[PDB]
Amino acid sequence: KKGAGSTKNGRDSKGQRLGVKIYGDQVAKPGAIIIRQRGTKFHPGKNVGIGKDHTIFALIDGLVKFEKYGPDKKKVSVYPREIQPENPNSYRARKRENFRLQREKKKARREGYS
Template identity: 40%
Template structure:
């Protein structure tokens, strides 16, 4: 390399010789960036777990959520992490109703505090119990 620099100073090399002798290689490969480059994050699979009209048992998870997107209706409980679950066995019924919220609940205050005093509609999960058979007999009759 020292020889080439000295010859260039003297002007002894032609233009084509300079181009062939002075090739520079990249020290690192060029890499493009991606938005989802972290392969260790797994999807959470939030949302509806049971569709309208399906039969569920007590304790069955109906929906998972981060914000209060779905609301508990008849015979449905709300977990600490926003999970909706069935309290009794029965058939699932999803309705769109005017929101009648418990404004003391922390989730309601966080999600709908700015809407207090206004009228809006939300999806409610309800569990309708299955009708029981009517084949009961009194113990005295048996």
């Protein structure tokens, strides 16, 4: 009836997908990106580099670690890991091999029936 009136707002940029990509105690390959950030919320530590956009990227294969770079700051490091395999007696290992066995035995019965 009466009317209305527009606004001087409406603009906004889309999410640039910042934040942590790889967390602590998780594998990271050489050249893999751990953090995509604007400033040095996290500093670079050992076995790790820094880019133009303050992008922290790994140089070796290992696990990520977060330390404190002084009283009120934090950094990132990538130390090598161990090479301990899994035992065959694990619930995961016994179950994993169970599929391989049932998949082959069920196959053997398919062509072996007739």
